[PDB]
Structures are given as structure tokens and as C-alpha cells.
Amino acid sequence: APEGVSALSDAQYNEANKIYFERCAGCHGVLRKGATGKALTPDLTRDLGFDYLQSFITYGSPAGMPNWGTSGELSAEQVDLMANYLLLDPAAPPEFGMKEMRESWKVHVAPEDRPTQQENDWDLENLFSVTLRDAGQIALIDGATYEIKSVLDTGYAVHISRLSASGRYLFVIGRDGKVNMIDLWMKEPTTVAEIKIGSEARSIETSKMEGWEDKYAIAGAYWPPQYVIMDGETLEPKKIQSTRGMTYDEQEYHPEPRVAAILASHYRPEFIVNVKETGKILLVDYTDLDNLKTTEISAERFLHDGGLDGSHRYFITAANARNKLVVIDTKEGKLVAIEDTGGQTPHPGRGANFVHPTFGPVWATSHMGDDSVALIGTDPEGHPDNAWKILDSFPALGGGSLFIKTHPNSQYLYVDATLNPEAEISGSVAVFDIKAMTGDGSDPEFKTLPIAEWAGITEGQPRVVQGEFNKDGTEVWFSVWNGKDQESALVVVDDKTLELKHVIKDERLVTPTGKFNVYNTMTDTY
Amino acid sequence: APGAPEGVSALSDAQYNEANKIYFERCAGCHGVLRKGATGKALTPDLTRDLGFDYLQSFITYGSPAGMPNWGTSGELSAEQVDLMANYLLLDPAAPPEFGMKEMRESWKVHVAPEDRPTQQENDWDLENLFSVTLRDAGQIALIDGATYEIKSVLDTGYAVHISRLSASGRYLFVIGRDGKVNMIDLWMKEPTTVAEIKIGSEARSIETSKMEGWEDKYAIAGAYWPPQYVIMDGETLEPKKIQSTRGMTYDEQEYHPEPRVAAILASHYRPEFIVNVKETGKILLVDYTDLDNLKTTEISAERFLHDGGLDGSHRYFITAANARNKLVVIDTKEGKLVAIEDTGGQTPHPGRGANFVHPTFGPVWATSHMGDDSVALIGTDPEGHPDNAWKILDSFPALGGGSLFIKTHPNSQYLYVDATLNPEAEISGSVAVFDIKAMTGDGSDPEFKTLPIAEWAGITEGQPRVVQGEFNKDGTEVWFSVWNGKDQESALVVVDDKTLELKHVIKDERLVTPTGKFNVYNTMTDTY
Ligand code: DHE
Ligand code: DHE
Ligand code: HEC
Ligand code: HEC
């Protein structure tokens, strides 16, 4: 006989459930099928059994599962409660409306009591806000001295950082929908406001229309299917919008359309919201939240990430499972093109904009499913025949690429290969010389930088990910992402010589992943 | 379970599926998606177990004169389907299904392609003076000559027929039923008939046509109670072009609402937009139909319980009742925003499209009567020339009694007609109140009214005749009222001479079964009210 799975009173079950959706669902999923954390459905957990679940929740694991019991985040009774709850069938995922957001909303420092000018000595625009994935923190690193200025707690499941248009406020979002607002002008920068906007979420963005600096922030959730516009100084939740709706092509109701990347228009006072499963791109005008104007653009399903072109007018985003790039004109508020990249699973991040020597302005992306790099023409006025067409496709290090990067002041295009199965490749970066490109059909050659080897890290599984440039566009940073119980680092590459500039190492630099330069993020320079 | 005490004569899964399809397709328009009843009674298990199999089988077989079709004896459901349904109704209520593009397209039929239709009117009818009258329990509409008063044609649309609307040019007649059935009729044919049809949901009430200058006959839109959605359709073929879900957040508490019904739908005359009331979330949508792929909409926070409403006399401002909250919500359709929300001081305002007129002392006003009390309320509708009266309730006075549904006037007339359809007294419910607009002063003295004995003029005694909804002819000189009696009883339409307030003519015919809504082509196509 299989061990006995205990009762649980209504109160206990209600208590367990609140904990699950508030603190576990960001990594284990609202239906318990897993996300960064393993699936915890009862077909799996009953086999593991109570003792095993209790031990894991008490001690955590170095692969990213918090030590709930030993950290005192959960009491001994709460730990047993959760182990017992995981042996039961998955509960119905709850909604998360205004009442729930406002209960979680905290303003630690009201706007009137914050500084009126920068009170620290830091070079805010050249700071790098780095995600410490399994530590639940971000590191604020000086872009010139390479010193860790501070390490701030945001919360387990920390995902990425974004900056307000003025560069004063640092916004961080976690996979649980937790949002932290950090005031960079304080003597000792810390969280001045926080709020939770759902159970699962990935994106956040700030108002970037000139004249709307610091007015609003917007966050998108995976569950429930909604986005929220918040006050840009206090995080007060002002407008919640459901994304449930019809698919663009079959026009069938879809009960769970996740919000993916959220960007901000520089032509109009609008947020640009990708709705994944229905294939809709939303242009949301924040001029008036009560008489709310939006444009719901039929695009392509599987929208994920993307970026604005060099002129900041057009939004280019990957509909990744269908291998397409979708192009929106933010000035006219309309779809302008849909093109296949020729590769498998394009994953641009915000992508890489540059001026090709013969094609004109282009935007590039690499792929998760193959080694190709694709370029799309982005200049309807000056290069009409090249506009929104794939002009070239060439191989980089290998499949498993996540991020491509460049900067106006650099002649090089950097491509990672983070998820490649071969350590030599996943620990390296491909670099192309833009000035040597000809678009004559021949594959441009690349130099291979041994980033992980340069950091002196071989133990564990160090994966190199995401180039990020400093404010001047002279140095590019890469994360050497190793396990929490392993040695990690950040490698700074001298852009002009393509030589190692510096290796950042520190006991607090745990699982570093996303890196965001204040100036480059606030101005959308990529 | 079937052999257990509490147990019911099961249907295999497949039999259940067939019954469930019949239920949602043919019964839910009147009995409700959760079987809680609408026009038809609740059919939930609590009640149906006490009727028992044989009662249900006979009720579904024979029907009744209250509006329930005789599915069995008409041949509409074969012998076995009746039993299936009777068995089905004893079971727990199924989860209401979605109704997307695939299901709409399966129901979409184009009987006469546009290429094959007339290029000019091929009958000799006076189309703009025609009246389209809903024959409720007959599942038909009657097309009636507005001057000779003869029934030109009786057309089958479907059980649960609700109301009629006209395309902007007056050529196409659109009718919607409570089951979401949409019929398009071409009034230019020698013998006008349905040229296209489609189904847009399981439960629905509204339909409307594009009225922006330049977009005449381009689009039609239908709104549903279930599923919670509206659909924009091609104005000539009924092809479903865009389906939009109305599921979303309430305007005030900002909490998700899984089933926000679509109530009235009107059309802007200032922008190429449809005006959609979303009842439970309290949102009014301004939907721009110039580009359905890059869809522009304005989601206006208003007040919950939005139901019916109309445009002011200038056609710029939408005025709609949030009925359970006793409020009028006013939207500026030129600027696309909320401009006011006001309490009428009455209970449950039910304006229909309302009544616009020029009050001698207040200026332009729009009026509504109420279901819950005898009051008539007036709101100022001219912010430009009468800014101190604009969007203010300027007067409130009594008409015949509570239970009023429709109030009506016309630019060519000085009278304001008010019905009292649901009043418990037959004496009141068979009459209509009429106020002289020219004698109104606005000093706080209730305007007096003349009582027209509309049911008595009809010369009907049997059943329980109720008078509903004034509708004028094209020239604004005669106003029609429906004398709604039961299906197996005699009904009529009464035509009143506006200038003398005397009986003009009584329309009676064997085919005139339960006449309710009446829509004059010209006054509907132009929004004259
Ligand atoms: C929707 C989304 C965005 C765009 C945010 C915005 O527009 O504000 C994004 C951006 C990002 C960006 C933005 C980079 C930029 O330059 O804009 C980075 C670095 C990033 C690093 C990672 N992402 Fe993130 N990421 C997801 C979703 C997203 N990632 C996932 O659904 C996914 C695949 C799985 C998951 O469970 O979360 C996932 C896993 C990862 C990682 O494993 C990465 C590599 C490392 C990590 O920190 O967990 N994601
Ligand atoms: C949403 C809605 C509209 C506006 C449509 C538009 O904007 O195109 C409307 C209009 C109407 C109009 C339009 C009048 C006008 O001048 O615009 C009429 C005459 C009408 C006669 C009736 N309505 Fe209708 N009506 C409902 C809903 C609606 N009715 C109901 O939810 C309700 C209360 C119950 C029901 O189950 O359907 C209902 C019962 C009735 C009746 O019992 C009426 C009186 C008679 C009948 O035919 O069933 N409704
Ligand atoms: C992300 C920051 C996490 C949060 C928040 C929670 N969990 Fe987790 N959990 C996470 C990971 C990455 C893993 C896999 C660890 C590994 O060593 O591979 C886990 C694992 C578990 C387990 C063990 C499951 C198994 O071994 O099959 C359990 C029982 C579990 N997690 C429970 C749990 C609960 C109850 C949480 C809320 C208190 C919770 N986790 C949060 C990542 C994350
Ligand atoms: C609107 C046109 C209807 C449609 C379509 C269907 N029904 Fe109906 N039904 C309707 C009314 C107005 C009434 C009340 C009749 C009365 O005399 O008061 C009914 C009643 C029933 C009943 C009897 C309930 C009772 O007596 O308490 C049953 C079992 C019933 N209806 C079933 C039914 C089915 C199975 C239908 C689909 C084929 C159906 N109805 C359609 C109005 C309308």
C-alpha cells in the first residue's frame, strides 16, 4: 500500500493555497506543470512522497529552489502544510484583480520624502543592473571601475531590469509578478515601492514618449492573462486590462493569452504589448486611462520578444514558433510586414540594429533552433526595395543562441550560443565585422571569443549569455552563468581590440544572467 | 449511477452530445445558456425532476400558446429527439460552449449572391414608409405599408425573433432573434426575402448597421449575451469579419468578469464607429470599422448595468440607461469620451432609443420613462447653446403609471407619447399617455397629459392585450402602437393621427400574431427620434 496522504482542514487548505499562488507558482506554474521549477503535479509528487517533499521545501536545492524552512520564510508547520498540499490535485488558478494588487502595494518612501537631486556619487548612466538569478537579487555594478556598488534584494524568481526614461528609477520584475521600484538618487539606493501584478509574469516597461518621462510603468503577466499600467512614481495600480480574447487567424476564443515583451513607443504616448497565443500586438495609449484608446493589431501567433529599429519608429518582433518577424509602424499604428527569417525559432531579445555597408539600415536576430543570423532591412524611405525583407542569413557559432548585440559606436556584431550542447560553443561568442560585410551572398566570417575560458571557469556548466554595452559603446559585457554552488563571472571585452578587458568575480555574484546598462536601456540604444 | 435511487435514465455520451447540441442551438435562445430561463421558463434539475419525463416529453411535443414551440407535432424534432431532450433536461446543466469563427461560418448561408441581386428596386412598394413588425411567437416579421396599412409580406426569420434594423441606404433589412440568428433581407427584390443568414452566438439581442456618411451598407454588427462577444459582418453578405470578446475587468472595482453581456449597439454619425454597451463591466466601446486588422477601439469606463439608449437630436452624444443603478450615462461620440453620469430620480429607466425634443424653456432635451415607477425624466442635450442645462436632469413628472417601456416623439410633432406596457392594471397597460411639448414650462408643475385608450380603440376583448412602443411613419404625421395579445388570441396595430390625437386606423389580420416591435424604414435608417 502506497503511503497515506493526510486530510487537511478547509482552513489549512486555504492557507496552503494562498502560499502556493503567492510564493511557488512563479517557478512551479499556476497549474503546477513547472516553469524554472519542476512540475509538482500529483502523478509525480505522490511517488516522491511526503518525506521527500518536506525535505526539499525545508532545505531547498542549489539549482534554484529556495530553502523555505531553513531560511525561516516558512515555519515548520507551513512546510508540512505545503508538502501535504502538493500530494493533492492542483487547485483552480485564481484571478488577481485590483483588490489583490492594492493589498500587495507598498510605498516605502513617498515621493515627497525622496531626494530632489542625486545624493550619491555614482555614475548612474554607466551603471549595470545585473540579475542574480538564484539569489533573488540584482547587482548594481559601476561601468567604469567594475566595482559592485550594491546588491539589492528584489525577491526569488527575479527576471529582468528596465529603466525610467529619465534614468532615475530602476524597475525590476520577477517571474512571480513581483515589481520593485528603486530610486537611484538616494544616498543608498533601495526599493521605494513594490507591488505584485499577477501569479506568473515576465515583462515590465516605462513610458518613453518625450514629455511622459516617469509618468507610467506597465507590467505584463502570464497568469492571469492581463497587463497593468501603474503610476511611474508610486507603482499605484491604475488600469488593469484582460488579454483573454480571440486568435487573430482562426478567430476562436483563447482563455489564456500570455503577455510577452512590452516595449514603449517614441512616436506616440503608447505602450507596445505582445499577446502571445492570440497573435495580437497592442498599442495602448496612456493619455487617458478611463476613455482608453488602443489599437489591436492582428499579427502572428507565438509573439515573444523584439525591439525597435534604429530610428525608433518600427517595432520588430519574433513570432518564434512560426519563425517569423512581425513589423509594426508605431507612427501609423499598423502592421507593415510579416516575414520568415529562414531559421528555426528566432530569439532576438531587443535585437541588433546597424548600417550594413551595401544594404542600408538593418536589424539582426539570431536563433535558438539553428546557427543562423538573419538581417532585415529597416529603411522604407532610403532603401525601399530592401525594406522589411530578409536580406542575408549566415551562420554563427551554433544553435542555441539567445542574444545578438551591437552599438552605434562599434563595428562589431556579437552573437552568443548559450544553450548549445557543446561547452566550447556555449562558453564562447561569435563576433562579426560589420564594415567587412558585402551582401554578395557569401557568409561573413566571425572571430570566436573564448569568454568562459577568459574568465578561468571550467567546472560546472558555465553558459555565456547576453552582450550588453557600456554608455560609451567602448566595452561589451557578457555573463558567465554558472550554477549557484559554482563559480560565475562577468567578462568585459574591449570593443575596439576584441580583447579581454576585465573579469568581474565576487562571492555575491551568484548566477548572473541579464545585464542592463542604465543609459542604453533608458534610451533604447541597441 | 442510473440504477441508484436518485438516478436518471441515462443517455450514452453520444446521445447526451446530440441533445446538448439541440439545446444550445434551438432552446437556449429562450431558456438560457445555464437553463435559468429567459423568455421561456427555467429548466434546471430542481424543477424538471418534479415535472418528470412524461410532462417534458408532452410539453416539448405539443408546446403551448405562451410561445413554446410544438417541436413534436410540427416535425421540427423527430419522435426520438423529443425523448432525448426530455431525458437531457433531467440531467445537470452542461457548460455553455464557445461560438467562434468556425461555428459562425458553418451557420453562414448566402441564398442570393450580391452579383445576382437587383441593381435597382424591382417592386413598387414605398420602401421608406414600410414598417417592419416583429411577430414574436410566430418567429416572423411583417412588412406593412405605412400609408395603405396593408401587410405586404410575412417573412420567416426564426423562433425568438427580436427586432429589426435597417442599413443606412434603406435597402437592407436586418433582423436578429434571441438565439443569435441574423437574417438579411433585400427590400429591392420583386418579392423581398432572406438573401443571407448567420448565427452569431447562443443568446443575443442587438444588431446595427454602419451609419457614418461614406460607409452606407458597408457593415453590420451583432452583440451577444452568450458567449460574451460582438461580431462585425460584411454589410452585403453577412460574412463574419471580426469577432471581439467582451470578457474583461469591471470599470469600478477592476476585477475580472467572465461573462459581460452585450446590450444595445448603436452607430456613430461623427466617426466610422459602432457604439457597444457592455452591461456587467460597465464599459461603452467605440469600435472603429475603417480597419479591422489594425483595430482601433476606445474603451470607456461608464456605469454597470448598461442596457438601452439613443443619440441626442444632433446625433453627437450617446445617452444610455444604466438601468439597475437608475443612471443616464452620456458619451461624446466626436471626442470619444464620457461626459456625464446622472441619476434620473426614477426607478429603472428604460428609454428604448428615447425621445429628443425642443422644450420651450429648457432647450433641446432627451427623455426616458421608467419600468419601476410612473416618472418621465428630461436631460438637457445642448452643451453649446445651453451649457447650464447640459447633461442635467431638468424635470421629472408622472405619466400613466409604472411599467413603462417606450417613450416617443418626432420632429414634425408637438406630442410626447408614453406607454405603460407592464403596469398591473389593464386600464393603464392598454392606454398611452400624451403630453403637449408646446405647453411645457418647467416651473415644477407636472405637465398634464391626454390618455389615449389604445387597446379599447382596437376593439379586442379576449386575452390580455398590452400596448407597447410608439413608432412614427416617415412624414411624422401618424404614430403606430402594437396591441400585443397572446399567440392564439387577436392582436392589432393601432394608428393614431398625430395632429388630432384621434384614431386613424386599426390593423387586424389572422397573420398578425403577437406584434411587438415596429420599425419604420426611414426613421430607423436615419435615427430620427
Ligand atoms: C517575455 C520575456 C522577455 C521580455 C521582457 C520585456 O520585454 O520586458 C524576456 C527577456 C529576457 C531578457 C532581456 C534581454 C534584453 O537585452 O532585453 C533576458 C536577458 C532574459 C534572460 C532569460 N530568460 Fe527571459 N524568459 C522568458 C520570457 C521573457 N524573457 C521565458 O518565458 C523564459 C523562456 C522561461 C521562463 O520560465 O522564464 C525565459 C527564460 C530566460 C532565461 O533562462 C534567461 C536566459 C536567464 C534568466 O535570467 O533566467 N529574458
Ligand atoms: C439589448 C436590448 C435591446 C436593444 C437592441 C439594440 O440596441 O439593437 C432591446 C430592444 C428592444 C426594442 C427596440 C425599440 C426601439 O425603438 O429601438 C423593442 C421594441 C423590444 C421589445 C421587447 N424586448 Fe428587447 N429585451 C431585452 C433586450 C433588449 N431589447 C431583454 O434582455 C429583455 C428585457 C428580455 C429578454 O429575454 O429578451 C427584452 C424583452 C423585450 C420584450 O418583452 C419586448 C417588450 C417585446 C418583445 O418583442 O419581446 N426590445
Ligand atoms: C524559483 C525561484 C522557485 C520558487 C519560488 C519555488 N521553487 Fe520549488 N523548485 C525550484 C526549482 C528550480 C526546483 C528544482 C530543483 C533541482 O534541484 O533540480 C524546485 C524543486 C522543488 C521541489 C522538488 C521536486 C522534485 O525534486 O521533483 C519541491 C517539492 C518544490 N520545489 C516545492 C516548492 C514550493 C512548495 C514552493 C513554494 C513555497 C517552491 N517550490 C518555490 C524553484 C522554485
Ligand atoms: C422561444 C421561442 C422558445 C424556444 C426556442 C423553446 N422554448 Fe421551451 N418554452 C418557452 C416558453 C415561453 C415556455 C413557457 C410555456 C408556458 O406555457 O408558460 C416554455 C416551456 C418549456 C417547457 C415546460 C416548462 C414548464 O412547464 O415548467 C419545456 C420542457 C421546454 N419549454 C422545453 C424546450 C426545449 C427542449 C426546447 C428546444 C427544442 C425549447 N423549449 C425551445 C419558449 C421556448
Q: What is the 3-state secondary structure (H, E, C) of A271-309?
A: EEEEECCCCEEEEEECCCCCEEEEEEEECCCCEEEEEEC
Q: What does chain B come to in residues?
A: 529
Q: Which atom of ligand 4 is nearest to the CA of B179?
A: 5
Question: Is residue B297 within 8 Å of A294, Cβ to Cβ?
Answer: yes
Q: What does chain A come to in residues?
A: 526
Per-residue cell: A47: 511517488
Which burial class, exposed, middle or buried, applies to B433 when counting CB atoms under 10 A from its CB (0-12, 13-18, 19+)?
buried
Q: Is A330 on the interface with B (CB under 8 A)?
A: no
Q: Report d(CA B243, CA A246) in Å as an integer.
A: 7
Q: Is A252 on the interface with B (CB under 8 A)?
A: yes
Q: Is A296 on the interface with B (CB under 8 A)?
A: yes
**Alpha carbon nearest to ligand 4 atom 12, residue:** B40
Last residue before each gap in chain B (C to N over 2.5 A): none
Give every CB contact of residue A30 below 8 A, 6+ residues apart in sequence: A21, A93, A199, A200, A223
Which of these, B276, B448, B433, B446, lies nearest to B355 by C-alpha position? Answer: B433
Residues of chain B numbered 332-351 and touching chain A (CB < 8 Å)? 336-338
- Closest ligand to residue A129's CA: 1
A247 vs A202, A297, A304, B256, CA distance in Å? 21, 11, 15, 20
Q: Is A331 on the interface with B (CB under 8 A)?
A: no
Output the CA A349–ligand 1 centroid distance in Å: 8
Which of these, A319, A366, A358, A361, lies nearest to A338 by C-alpha position? Answer: A319
Can you name the residues that pair with A107 across neighbouring β-strands? A193
Give every CB contact of residue A129 below 8 A, 6+ residues apart in sequence: A138, A139, A140, A161, A163, A170, A172, A515, A516, A518
Peptide linkage before A357 cis (omega within 30 of 0): no
**Alpha carbon nearest to ligand 4 atom 22, residue:** B59
Can you name the residues that pair with A218 across neighbouring β-strands? A205, A229
Q: Is A290 on the interface with B (CB under 8 A)?
A: yes
* φ, ψ at A259 (rounded to 5°): -85, 130
Does residue A58 line the site of ligand 1, with CB under 6 A? no
Per-residue cell: A115: 531626494
3-state secondary structure of A97: coil
- Give the start-end residues of each E strand in B109-199: 109-110, 131-135, 140-144, 151-156, 161-166, 172-177, 181-186, 194-199
For residue B16, what is the enclosing H or E element? helix B13-22
Output the CA A426–ligand 1 centroid distance in Å: 17
Over its C-alpha atoms, chain B yields an Rg (Å, rounded) of: 23
Place of cell 539606493: A189
* B30 noted as active-site residue: yes
Q: What share of chain B is helix, strand, coil (3-state, %, to 5)?
A: 15, 35, 45
CB pairs A-B closer than 8 Å: 96
* φ, ψ at B21 (rounded to 5°): -65, -45
- The single residue of B233, B257, B269, B307 carrying the catalytic annotation is B307
* φ, ψ at A145 (rounded to 5°): -90, -15
Q: Report d(CA A448, CA A455) in Å as an integer.
A: 15
* φ, ψ at A372 (rounded to 5°): -75, 150
* φ, ψ at A453 (rounded to 5°): -55, -45
Question: Is residue B117 within 8 Å of B188, Cβ to Cβ?
Answer: yes
- Closest ligand to residue A133's CA: 1
Other Cβ atoms closer than 10 A to A505: 14
Within its chain, how far is the Cα of B114 from the centroid? Answer: 27
3-state secondary structure of B415: strand
Chain B residues whose CB is inside 8 A of the A298 CB are 293-295
A290–B253 C-beta distance less than 8 A = no
Q: Is A489 on the interface with B (CB under 8 A)?
A: no
Which of these, B443, B376, B447, lies nearest to B407 by C-alpha position? Answer: B376
Does residue A280 line the site of ligand 3, with CB under 6 A? no
B71 marked as binding residue: yes
Q: Report d(CA B339, CA B95) in Å as an integer.
A: 39
Chain B residues whose CB is inside 8 A of the A336 CB are none
A254 marked as binding residue: no
3-state secondary structure of A257: coil
3-state secondary structure of B513: coil
Per-residue cell: B304: 454597470
3-state secondary structure of A425: helix
Does residue A65 line the site of ligand 3, with CB under 6 A? yes
Residue A431 DSSP class: E
Question: Is residue A450 within 8 Å of A428, Cβ to Cβ?
Answer: yes
* B27 noted as active-site residue: yes
Which of these, A322, A310, A326, A268, lies nearest to A293 by C-alpha position? Answer: A268
- Give the start-end residues of each E strand in A380-496: 390-395, 404-405, 412-415, 429-433, 446-449, 463-469, 475-481, 489-494
Strands B294-301 and B337-343: unpaired
Nearest CA in chain A to B331: A291
Which burial class, exposed, middle or buried, applies to B112 when counting CB atoms under 10 A from its CB (0-12, 13-18, 19+)?
middle
Give me the DSSP letters along B472-496: E-TTSSEEEEEEE--TTS--EEEEE
Resolution value, angstrom units: 2.1
Chain B residues whose CB is inside 8 A of the A102 CB are none
For residue A522, what is the enclosing H or E element? helix A518-522
Q: Report d(CA B476, CA B497) in Å as an integer.
A: 10
For residue B154, which amino acid is it? V
Which burial class, exposed, middle or buried, applies to A511 when counting CB atoms under 10 A from its CB (0-12, 13-18, 19+)?
buried
Per-residue cell: B423: 403596469
SS (H, E, C) B64-103: CCCCCCCHHHHCCCCHHHHHHHHHHHHCCCCCCCCCCHHH
B19 vs B1, B100, B263, CA distance in Å? 20, 20, 29
Which of these, A28, A10, A12, lies nearest to A20 by C-alpha position? Answer: A28
Give every CB contact of residue A52 below 8 A, 6+ residues apart in sequence: none
Q: Report d(CA A64, CA A56) in Å as an integer.
A: 11
**Distance in Å, alpha carbon of B6 to nearest chain A alpha carbon:** 28
Chain B residues whose CB is inside 8 A of the A229 CB are none
Per-residue cell: B480: 403606430
Other Cβ atoms closer than 10 A to A331: 13
- Say what the alpha-carbon torsion angle B226, B229, B230, B231 is, to the nearest 10 degrees: -100
Other Cβ atoms closer than 10 A to A149: 17
- Closest ligand to residue A263's CA: 1
Output the CA B178–ligand 2 centroid distance in Å: 9
Peptide linkage before A224 cis (omega within 30 of 0): yes
Give every CB contact of residue B98 below 8 A, 6+ residues apart in sequence: A252, A253, B227
Among A17, A36, A41, A65, the mutation site with the greatest number of ligand 3 atoms within 8 A of its Cβ is A65
Question: Is residue B405 within 8 Å of B469, Cβ to Cβ?
Answer: yes
Output the CA A205–ligand 1 centroid distance in Å: 14
Per-residue cell: B498: 398625430
Among B135, B162, B277, the mutation site with the greatest number of ligand 2 atoms within 8 A of its Cβ is B162
Question: Is residue A389 within 8 Å of A469, Cβ to Cβ?
Answer: no
CA angle B411, B413, B417 (to 5 degrees): 105
A28 marked as binding residue: yes
Q: Report d(CA B9, CA A432) in Å as an integer.
A: 74
Per-residue cell: A202: 515576465
Per-residue cell: A74: 516558512
B174-208 burial: b if 16+ Cβ within 10 Å, else e: bbbbbbbbbbbbbbbeeebebbbbbbbbbbbbbbb
3-state secondary structure of A164: coil
Does residue A352 line the site of ligand 3, with CB under 6 A? no
Q: Is A268 on the interface with B (CB under 8 A)?
A: no
Does residue A511 line the site of ligand 1, with CB under 6 A? no
Per-residue cell: A419: 544553450
Per-residue cell: A436: 567587412
**Distance in Å, alpha carbon of B213 to nearest chain A alpha carbon:** 23
Over its C-alpha atoms, chain A yields an Rg (Å, rounded) of: 23
Give every CB contact of residue B267 below 8 A, 6+ residues apart in sequence: B208, B209, B210, B211, B212, B273, B274, B275
- Closest ligand to residue B220's CA: 2
Give me the DSSP letters along B23-64: IIIIIHHHH-TTS--SSSPP--HHHHHHH-HHHHHHHHHH--
Output the CA B313–ligand 2 centroid distance in Å: 22
Q: Report d(CA A163, CA A208) in Å as an integer.
A: 10
Which burial class, exposed, middle or buried, applies to B398 when counting CB atoms under 10 A from its CB (0-12, 13-18, 19+)?
middle
Q: Report d(CA B191, CA B130) in Å as an integer.
A: 14
Chain B residues whose CB is inside 8 A of the A224 CB are 256
A292–B298 C-beta distance less than 8 A = yes
Q: Report d(CA A366, CA A402) in Å as an integer.
A: 7
Which burial class, exposed, middle or buried, applies to A322 when counting CB atoms under 10 A from its CB (0-12, 13-18, 19+)?
middle
**Does the CA dihedral B154-B158-B159-B160 come out positive or negative?**
negative
B474 marked as binding residue: no
* Cross-chain CB nearest to A253 (options B100, B240, B301): B100
Per-residue cell: A237: 495600480
* φ, ψ at A387 (rounded to 5°): -55, 125
Output the CA B516–ligand 2 centroid distance in Å: 9
Per-residue cell: A328: 509594426
Can you name the residues that pair with B197 across neighbouring β-strands? B109, B183
Q: Report d(CA B107, CA A262) in Å as an integer.
A: 38
Q: Report d(CA B401, CA B406) in Å as an integer.
A: 13
* φ, ψ at A113 (rounded to 5°): -100, 0
Place of cell 426607478: B347
Q: Report d(CA B300, CA B337) in Å as an integer.
A: 7
Structural domains in chain B? 1-97 (1.10.760.10), 98-529 (2.140.10.20)
B307-318 burial: b if 16+ Cβ within 10 Å, else e: bbbbbbbebbbb
Place of cell 406584434: B515
- The single residue of B30, B85, B184, B212 carrying the catalytic annotation is B30
Residue B291 DSSP class: -
Which of these, B330, B237, B327, B331, lies nearest to B287 by C-alpha position? Answer: B331
CA angle B410, B416, B417 (to 5 degrees): 105
Give me the DSSP letters along A7-54: ---HHHHHHHHHHIIIIIHHHH-TTSS-SSSPP--HHHHHHH-HHHHH
Question: Is residue A214 within 8 Å of A166, Cβ to Cβ?
Answer: yes
* Cross-chain CB nearest to B294 (options A245, A288, A295): A295
Per-residue cell: B228: 460574451
B255–A95 C-beta distance less than 8 A = yes
Give every CB contact of residue A72 below 8 A, 6+ residues apart in sequence: none
Residue B147 DSSP class: T
* φ, ψ at B369 (rounded to 5°): -105, -175
Mutate to test the interface with A, among B104, B294, B298 (most CBs of A within 10 A): B294
Output the CA A37–ligand 1 centroid distance in Å: 15
Q: Report d(CA B76, CA B316) in Å as an integer.
A: 47
Per-residue cell: A3: 503511503
Which of these, A299, A298, A350, A361, lies nearest to A324 by C-alpha position? Answer: A299
Among B21, B31, B49, B83, the mutation site with the greatest number of ligand 4 atoms within 8 A of its Cβ is B31
Distance between terminal CA atoms of chain A? 61
B353-386 burial: b if 16+ Cβ within 10 Å, else e: bbbbbebeebbbbbbbbbbbbbbbbbbbbbbeeb
A290–B298 C-beta distance less than 8 A = no
SS (H, E, C) A206-252: ECCCCCCCCCEEEEEEEECCEEEEEECCCCCEEEEEECCEECCCCCC
Which strand ranges, in their side-by-side order, compose the sheet holding A216-223? A200-206, A216-223, A226-231, A237-242
**Alpha carbon nearest to ligand 1 atom 23, residue:** A159
For residue A481, which amino acid is it? W
Which of these, B189, B187, B188, B184, lies nearest to B174 by C-alpha position? Answer: B184
